[model samples]
Target: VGTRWAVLVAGSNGYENYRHQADVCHAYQLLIKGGLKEENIVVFMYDDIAWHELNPRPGVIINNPRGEDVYAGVPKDYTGEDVTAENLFAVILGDRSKVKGGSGKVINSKPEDRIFIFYSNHGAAGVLGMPNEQILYAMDFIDVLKKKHASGGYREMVIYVEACESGSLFEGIMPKDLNVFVTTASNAQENSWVTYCPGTEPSPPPEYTTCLGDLYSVAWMEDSESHNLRRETVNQQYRSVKERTSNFKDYAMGSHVMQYGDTNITAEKLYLFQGFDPATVNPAKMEVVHQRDAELLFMWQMYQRSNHLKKTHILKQIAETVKHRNHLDGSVELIGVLLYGPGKGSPVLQSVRDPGLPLVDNWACLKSMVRVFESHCGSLTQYGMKHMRAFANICNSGVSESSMEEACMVACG
Candidate 1:
C-alpha cells in the first residue's frame, strides 16, 4: 500500500444547510479515525455554520441527532470564498499554482498513492452548487478527473457524492478505464434525501432547527464507523449504503444510490483508501425529508418554536419562499410552452433520455441554456433546482441556444 489522500468538501453555506458542512466534518473525523493523517487530507467548507446565529450549540457541528462534535479537528484548508470549483480542481490535480486562495495544501500524491474524495452539496441535473452562487458543471469536473488520471499521480481514486442527481456527474461521460470509482446519493434524475430533521425520528435537540446530515452521506459514514474497513471491500460498503438509503416501504422517502466508472477497483479492501476502524453499533429508525424542501423544513420548524413576533416573521419568510417556488414553476412552464407549444410543452419538459446517454450531447450548450434562463428569470433557488432537468431536456431536444434565449425573454423577462 502507498499513501492515502482524501478530499472532503461541503459546498453549501448557511445556517439552513447545516447538514452539508456537518456531513463533511463527520467524514473528516472518520478519515482521521481510519488512520489518514491531516497532511494528506484537504477540506473545503464555507466555514460559517458552526457559530452562525441560529446554531444552538456554538462552535460545534454534529452529523447525527445524538452524535459527538465532528467539527473539532477538521482543517480549514479551503474555507469561506475559497470553497470553489477552481480551487477543488486545482487541489485534486495537486497544482498549487492554480489555486486562488485559502490554505495552499494540494493532494501532491505519488504515482503509487490512492485518493478518496467526498462531496456533499446541493446539485441539479448536471451541475453542483458552490459557494457565492457559483456552479460546478459536470463535464468540467470529469475533465479535471481525466487530467488527474493522465498525470499518473495516483494509482486509483474513489469518489462519494451526496447531492441531487449526483449520478449525472459520471453517467455517460466518465470512462471505466480511468481507475476511478464513484458512488452517488441519487441517480441521474432524482433528489437525494436529508435526515435528522426537526420533526424526524432520531431528531436533533429541540432547540436546533436544521437537519443534521444527508441520507446517503450518513449511511456510508455511519457504516464506516461500525464496520471493520480492513476486511470490508468498497463494493460491500456501496451495497450497505444503497440498502440503507433506499426506502423499500415508501418510495418518496429515499433515493437510488448509484455506482459508476470502474467496477474492478471496488473489490479492493476499503482500508486501502481510508484505513481501518470499528465502533459500537446502535441502529436507529430513519426519518427523511426531501432535500429540495430542506429550507422549508427549517422555516416551518422555526415558525413552530418561535414567539408570535418571530412566528410572524418566519410566516412571511415561508410565504415568500412559496411564492418564489410558484414563480419558478410558472417560469419554467412558460418557457416550455413558448418553445414547444401547449400540450407538447409538458411532455418535453418531463422527457427522460434513453439510458446510457449523458444528460446532454454538448455540455457547453447546456451551460449556455442555464445562463440564459437564470439571466432573464433569477437564480434557480434550491427549490427550483429540479427545473434544471427540464433545461437539460431542452438542450437534449436539439433546441438552439438562440431559441432558448428568445424563450427566456418572452417567458421570464
Candidate 2:
C-alpha cells in the first residue's frame, strides 16, 4: 500500500459560475471529512466567489440549497489567475521546477499510491474552460496522464469531471492500461448541469442570490456525506447520479452521464479516494437538488428580484444565451449542409439536436476539422465549440476532403 492523494479543481470564474468554486470547496471538505490528511489533497480554484460583491453571504460557499458553508476550510493552494492547465498538469506530474505559486504541492506520491482528481467548470466538446480564456484541451490532458503513467507514481487513479461535453475529454482517448478511471457529467456530445441556482430551493435565505453546485458533482458528494465511504463504492455513486439526472420530476437534464477506462476500478471503496471520517459515526440523510442552466436560472432570478438596473441585467444575460442559442441553431444546420450537402437531408442532420449523438472513434478527423474551423472563422473558445459534434458527424459520414474544406468556407466562416 502507498499514500493516497487527491486533486480538486474549479476551472472557471465569474459570479454566474459560483457553483463551480463552491463545488470544489465542497469536494475539499468532503475529502477532509472522509479522512484524507489535509496536506495530501491539492485544490485549484479561482477562489473569487466567497467574498465577491454578488454573494449575499460573504466569505462562505454552499453546495446544497440550504447547505452548510463549504468554503471555510478549503485550502488555497492554487487560485485566481494561477489556476491554469499549465499549473494543473505540472501539479499532476509533481514537477516542482515548473511551479508558479500555489503552495508548490504536486502529486509526489509513490508507485503504489492511489490518486483521485475532480474537475468542475464550463466546457465545450473538446476542452474545459479556465479563467482568462485558457482552456484545458483534451489532447493535453491525455498526454499529461501518459506522462504520469510513465513516471510510475501511482497504482491507480480516478477522475470525476463535471462540465459540458466532459465525456469528450476521455472517450476512446484515455488508455485502458494507464490505471486511470473516468466518470463525466455528460457524454462526448452533451451538457452537464448546474443545480441549486438562485430563486430555487434553498432560496437565498430571503436575501442571498446565486447558483450553488453542479448536479452530477453534488449528487455523488451527498452520497459520500450520507453513507459510509468505506462501505460504498464509486460504481454505486455513478449509477445513482446517472439515474437521478436521467429522469427527475418527469423531466431529464438531457445530459447522459458516461464513464471510461477501467471501469472495474469503480468497485473500490469510495474511502480509498474520498478518505474516511471515523469520527462521524452516523452520516447525514441525503438531500435532493434541482439541475438547470446557470445562465437561464440567473436570468429568471434577476427578473424575479427587481426592476430598472436589475431588469437591465436580466435582459442582457438572457439575450446573450438566446443569441448564442439562435446562432447554434443556425450553425448546426449550416454545418449539416457542409457535411451531407444541401438538400441531402438525412439522419446525419439529427446529430446536433437535443442530448446529441456520440463521436466515438472519430477524433483524428474531428480534431483536424476543429482546428480548420478555428483558423478560418471562430475560436474553439467561442460558442463555435458546440459545433464539435457536427464536425465529427461530417467525418463519420465520409464526406470528401475537397467538399469538407469548401463547406467550411461558408458553414464555419
Candidate 3:
C-alpha cells in the first residue's frame, strides 16, 4: 500500500467511438471505489459524446449491457486539444510549467507512490489517436516514462491500454528494469475486439451509434469490479483478462491480448495501484459478450436498424470511413511504389499488412515515416491509423530512413 495515483485517458472523440470514453470512466469508478484518493487521479476525455444532440440518454454512459451509468462523476482533467503527448508527459512528470492546457494536474508523486495509467482509443501499430487528428507515438510515450523514472518520483507504474495493435506501443519501447508493467488489448499485429451489441440486453440507447466495451478493457475492469481487488495480483488479473479477451477457442477474435515489460511487477496486488476497499458493494460478475469489429458493426447496424435522421447521420459517417480508408490505401501504395519500384510495389502493399510482422524495435524510423506522412498528407489520427502496417513494413524490410523520408516527399508531393 502506498500513495496511489492514476491517469485515465479516453483518447478519441465523437459518438461512434463511444466505448473508449466509457472504458476510462469505468476505470475511474474502480479506482475511486478501491479507495484511491480523487485528488491523485487525473482523467482525460473528449467529453463530446454524452451531451451529443443525438444521444438518446443524454449525460449518461454505460459499458456493458444493463450496466449502470459510468459517466456520472467522471473527471475531465485534460480534454480537447490539451490531451496530447507533450501534455500527457508533462503531467506524468509532475512538471506543471511545461504543460500547455487543462488543470495542469500532474501526478504529484513521491518515490514511494505507485501510479496507474489507463488509455483507450483507436491505434495503429505504434501510435494511439487523440481527439483531433493527432497521435501519441510509442516512442514519445516510452521516453516520457523514461524521464519519469529518471526523475525518481515514483516506485512502480502499471498501465492498461485499450486499442488495436496496442502491444506495439511497448513491445520494444519500455525498459524492463524500470518497475513499469503494461497490458495491451491486442498484440502488435491484431485489432482489439469490441463488445455489447444489438442483440445484447440493456440495449444501446436509441441514439447510441456503436459499441460500449472494448474486449480486454471490459475484461479487466469487470474483474476488478467483481472481485476483492486487494487479493487479486496483477498476474491473476492479467491471466483472467487474457483468458476472457481470447483463448484459443473461447473468445478468440483474431486479436491476441498481450503484455510486456517486467513480469516481477505483475506480482504486486492490483489494490496497490487501484486500491481495493472490501465490503464495497462491488457489481455482479459479468458474462463475456460477443467479440466484434466495432466499425464493421456500425456499418452492419447502419443498414439493419431503424431508418431516420439518425440513420442519415450514421450513413454519412460510414461513407467517410470508407472514403478515408480508400484514400489511405492509395497513398500507402504510392509510398510502396516509390520504395520498392513499380511492379514489385503491389507485393509490398500486401506484405506490409502481414499479420506475422515482427515487433517495431526501430521506432525512430517508424516515427519519422509517420511524421512525414502526417506533414504531407493529413492528420494521422483520422487518416493515418489505416496505414500503421505500412510503417511496420518499412521497419521490417530494413528500408533506409533517408529513403522513406524522400519517398514520403515524392509520394505525397
Candidate 4:
C-alpha cells in the first residue's frame, strides 16, 4: 500500500554537459537515502560524465562545489545509447516488449503505487533532447501518459523537468485529469539555467570546467535533502523552488518555474512520491548561468587552463561551435524571410505564442516542418533549439508544407 517508483533521466551526453547527469545522480542519492528501494528506482544517464577524460575525480560525480560524490552507487538501468525517449516511455508504460535497450527495468507499479519522474537536459518547444538520433516530441510523450493512465498502473504521478522551455512540454497539451502533476524549470518561451559552474559563487573545484548542477534541479533536491518530506507538500516545494529559481539579484539568472496537469495531486505529501528522509542540511547558494552558455563557459575555462599547444585546439572547437550557431541561426532566419517576407519573417520568428495557447496547432505539421528544415539545413544545434518555437509558429500560421520546402530550399541550398 506504500510502494513508490521513480525514473530519473539526464537526457544529454558528453562531459561538457555534466550538470544534467550530475543532477540525476544526486536525485538517485536523495531517493535511495530517503527510504526508496534501489530496485524500485530506475535511472537513465549517458553514463559518460564520471569517467570523462576531463573529470579530475574519476568515477565520481557531485552536484555541488564541495558536495559528496553522487555517482558512487547510482543505478545504471539505462546508460550510453540506452538513455533514450523510447526506453523512457517503455519504462513508464511497463511495457518490456517495447523496450529496445537498458536494464529492462520498468515501473511495474500497482494501482495504489505512486510514481515520480525527473528529467534534466537541453529542451526546446515541445521537444526533449536525447543522445540518439530520434527527437522526443511533446505530443508523443502526452500519448504515453494517456496510455499509462488507461493502463491503470499507478494512483498518482509527479513529474519535475529541468530544461530550456520545459513548460512547453505540458502547457495546453497534457490533460489535467491524468492524475499527474508536473513542474518545469522554465516557461514555454524561456531558458533554464545551470549553477555551480567555474565562475559562479560556490563554484566547483578549479579542475572542473563544467557546471555541477542545474539551478531548478538543485533547488528542489536540496530542499528535499534539508526538510522532512512527510511534512512538506508537493505544492509547497514547488512554491519554494519557484521563489528560489526566479533569480535573486539585480542581474537576470533564472526562469519562471511552472506547474501543470492535475493540480490536485500537488496537495499530497512529498514523501508519497519518494518516501521520506530525516537528515537536514544547509540550503544551496544561488548563482545561475544560462544553459546555452554552459558549453561556452566550459570551453572558456578549458581555454584558460590549456597550454599554448592545447589552446589552439580549444580555439578551433570554439570557432566550430560558433560557425554552427551562425549557420543554424542564419538558415532559420532565411527560411523565415523566404516563407513570410522580411517584415513578417523576423516578427514571426521572434514572437512567442499568446498565453493559454499551445506552441502549435498541429503536432505533425511541426514535425514535418522540422524535418524539412533539417533536410536542407543541418540538424538543430543546442544553441539553435530556441528556434523550435519559430517552427511551431510556422505550423500555427498554417504555412503550407510545399511553401516550407521552398523556403528551406532557397534558404539553405
* Order of the predicted models by lDDT, top scorer first: 1, 4, 3, 2
**Per-residue alpha-carbon lDDT of candidate 2 for residues 116-212, written as tens digits (9 for 90 to 100):** 9999878776677777666566877889899999989799899999888888777656788998888888877667766665555545455555677
Candidate 4 off by > 4 Å: 249-251, 279-285
RMSD to truth, every model: 1.9, 3.9, 3.6, 1.7
Please give, for residues 1-413, the per-residue lDDT of candidate 3 as tens digits.
36999999887887667888888888988888888877899998888878877466879888876668899998778888877777788888898889898877889798999999999878877788888667777888888888888879799899999887787787756678888999887877667767675544446555466778877888898898888876789999988888777744443443566778778988888888888867755532222333224655656675667588577776777788777767667888999998988998767655533333345657677777777777776665444575776776777788887887788788666
**TM-scores of all predicted structures:** 0.96, 0.84, 0.87, 0.97
**How well does candidate 3 score on lDDT at residue 317?**
72
Model 4 agreement with the true structure over 1-413: per-residue lDDT tens digits:
75899999887887889999999999999999889998899999889988888999999999987769999998879988797788989999997899987788898888999999999988889888887655788999999989999989899999999999999898889898889999999988888888888877876788788889888999999888888888889999999999888876322677899889888987799989977876653324377788888898899889988898579999999999988998898888888888888889989877887656788889999889889988988787656677889898888778899999899988888
Tens digits of lDDT, candidate 1, 1-413:
69999999887888889999999999999999988899999999999998898888889999897769999989999999899888999999999999999889999989999999999979978889887778888999999888888989899899999999898888889899889999999988888999888887886887888899898999999887887787789999999899889966355778888999989998998889988764633224477888888888898888888897478988998999899989999999999999999999999998877646798888888778778989999887655667877888898888888999899999877
Candidate 2 residue runs with Cα over 4 Å from true position:
201-204, 248-251, 283-292, 345-368, 380-384, 395-413
Q: For model 3, what is the error of residue 354's alpha carbon versus the real structure, in angstroms, after optimal superposition?
A: 12
Query: lDDT (CA) for every model shown?
Result: 0.88, 0.74, 0.77, 0.87
Q: Using TM-score, rank the candidates from best to worst.
A: 4, 1, 3, 2
Best by lDDT: 1
- Compared with the true structure, model 3 gives a TM-score of 0.87
Candidate 1 has what TM-score? 0.96
